[PDB]
Amino acid sequence: GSQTFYGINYGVNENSCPTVDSMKNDFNVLKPYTNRVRTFALSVCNQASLALAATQALGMRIYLGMWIDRPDTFDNEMNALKNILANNDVSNVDGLIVGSEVLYRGDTDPQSLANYIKQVKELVAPHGIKVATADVYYKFPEVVVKELDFLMMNAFPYWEGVTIDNAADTLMSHYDQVVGASLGKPVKISETGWPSAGGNFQSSVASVENENKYLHDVLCRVKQRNIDLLYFSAFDEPYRGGVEAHFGVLGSDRNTKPGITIEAGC
Numbered sequence: 362g363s364q365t366f367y368g369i370n371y372g373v374n375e376n377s378c379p380t381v382d383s384m385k386n387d388f389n390v391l392k393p394y395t396n397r398v399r400t401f402a403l404s405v406c407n408q409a410s411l412a413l414a415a416t417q418a419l420g421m422r423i424y425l426g427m428w429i430d431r432p433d434t435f436d437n438e439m440n441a442l443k444n445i446l447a448n449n450d451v452s453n454v455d456g457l458i459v460g461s462e463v464l465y466r467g468d469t470d471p472q473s474l475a476n477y478i479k480q481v482k483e484l485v486a487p488h489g490i491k492v493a494t495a496d497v498y499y500k501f502p503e504v505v506v507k508e509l510d511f512l513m514m515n516a517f518p519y520w521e522g523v524t525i526d527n528a529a530d531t532l533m534s535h536y537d538q539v540v541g542a543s544l545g546k547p548v549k550i551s552e553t554g555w556p557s558a559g560g561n562f563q564s565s566v567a568s569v570e571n572e573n574k575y576l577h578d579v580l581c582r583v584k585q586r587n588i589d590l591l592y593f594s595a596f597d598e599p600y601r602g603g604v605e606a607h608f609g610v611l612g613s614d615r616n617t618k619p620g621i622t623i624e625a626g627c
Contacts, residue, residue: 365580365623368397368424368455369610370552370594371412377600378406384415390615391595394623396421397455399551399591402428403441413449424551424591426458426495427481430468435477442484454490457481458513458551461495464502471502478508495551498535501542513551513591514539519604522563525571528555529578536588547589553579554593557618559604567604569620576610577626584625 369391373379379387388398398416400423403409409425416423425445427438445451459478463469469477474494482492491510498516506512516535518528532553539548555575556567576592583590597609597618612618 362623363393363396365625366395366397366592367583367589368399368422368591369395370554370591371398371400372594372596372598373401373406373408374598374600375405379408379411381411381414381418384411385418387595387615388415388419388421390611392419392421394610397423397591398595399424399426399458401426401461403438403445404428409441409445410449413445413451413453417450417453422453422455424456424458425454427460429460429463429477430466435469439477439481439484442481446484446488451485451488451490454488456511456513457485457490457492459492459494461551462497462500462515463494464500464505465497471504475504475508478505482508482510493549493551498538501539503542503544506542506544506546509546511547511549512539512543513549515552516550517553517555517593519555519562519565519567519575522565524564525555525566525574528565528575529582532579533582533586536586549589549591550583551591552593553590554608556604556607557597557609557621558607562604567607569618572607572618573621576621577624580625581627584627 493511493513495513518531523531555572557569557572559567594608597613
């Protein structure tokens with residue numbers, strides 16, 4: 362069942378950096394469920410270069426994310442990208458994600474983001490790598506979307522207080538809004554998930570049964586509609602605390618979470 366996930370988001374603890382074998386370890390744990398991972402930053406922990414080597418060793422694919430927010434990050438991530446292009450094989454890269462929630466956070470204005478994307482595309486287009494940005498469903502302005510090859514949505518019904526039975530359906534409604542902004546370009550899902558513990562957010566209850574249901578339902582819906590999804594996330598991440606420490610498909614120690622069955626709901 363290594364097509365159960367189109368791909369899975371893979372978090373990096375900046376305060377406790379992974380290594381190639383450690384990543385190989387982590388990726389082998391994921392290999393029975395998927396052939397593709399996604400990283401969030403290029404320079405942080407040298408994670409892009411490490412993940413390229415681990416995935417390539419295992420015959421896996423990768424989406425490389427650029428992490429842009431504070432002013433220094435634009436030039437610095439761009440330089441990190443140039444370094445990767447000089448120093449690494451990038452043949453297994455299925456996309457470059459130029460920021461995540463840049464416009465949601467108000468880190469820059471739409472035209473500036475669009476210009477930066479244009480500059481990044483000029484760097485990677487000669488390698489046949491397509492560019493996207495990831496954001497919430499209402500932050501895909503035309504000036505940005507014009508520069509993209511495809512769009513990627515981040516959406517968490519959990520953080521909207523949507524009860525579990527309705528959560529995958531709300532995800533799909535939000536997807537259709539991104540299609541509405543897409544200028545006809547492909548739309549993928551860069552993040553969605555549901556926590557197994559840590560309380561509730563209004564009617565959204567964190568439980569293993571609810572994470573299991575959300576996983577099954579979302580995998581089903583994206584299969585029905587032929588949508589590419591990066592599920593959030595591979596492993597629980599204890600450092601985030603509260604519900605944020607419980608979004609993994611698998612546990613923080615890389616063991617399976619009892620009550621999660623890794624299967625699509627249709």
